[PDB]
Design a protein around this ligand. Structure first.
Ligand SMILES: CCn1c2c(c(=O)[nH]c1=O)[C@H]1C(=C(C)N2)C(=O)OCc2ccccc2OCCOc2cc(C)ccc21
Length: 126
């Protein structure tokens, strides 16, 4: 029923790079999704207490959210663009695993995912 610690957004032992692709992921991709009308469920770690979801963190064992991603990008946490893309994909997949296919939140995630995949199709070359 309680929340786990959130995913780390810094770690002095983890290697990292600043690449043009990661800058794009922050300045274009994250910013575009963050401002979307459907972003709000995804802007912070899932609070299973507030949401009365005592099974959330029994079903979702790799939690991810755009607040964490935003901090990771701002903090230069990632080694490459693929690490960040994987975090977005985990976030969307978690929503589809936890929720039923007809749910409103699934429609919202699907709209954000469509936009996300459009923006990463324009991902600049390394
Ligand atoms: C991403 C994590 N997430 C998630 C929800 C969810 O259902 N599934 C998830 O995976 C919830 C939810 C959030 C922040 N996040 C929220 O704010 O819920 C308030 C709430 C509190 C107590 C009781 C019911 C209740 O709302 C029932 C409808 O829930 C909806 C419906 C829509 C359109 C969007 C989100 C949600």
């Amino acid at each position: 029923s309680m929340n786990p610690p959130p995913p780390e957004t810094s770690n002095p032992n983890k290697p990292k790079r600043q690449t043009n692709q990661l800058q794009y992921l922050l300045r274009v991709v994250l910013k575009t999704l963050w401002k979307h009308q459907f972003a709000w469920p995804f802007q912070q770690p899932v609070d299973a207490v507030k949401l009365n979801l005592p099974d959330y963190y029994k079903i979702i064992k790799t939690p991810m959210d755009m607040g964490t991603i935003k901090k990771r990008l701002e903090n230069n946490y990632y080694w490459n663009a693929q690490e960040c893309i994987q975090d977005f994909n985990t976030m969307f997949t978690n929503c589809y695993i936890y929720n039923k296919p007809g749910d409103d939140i699934v429609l919202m995630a699907e709209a954000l995912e469509k936009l996300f995949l459009q923006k990463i199709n324009e991902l600049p070359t390394e």
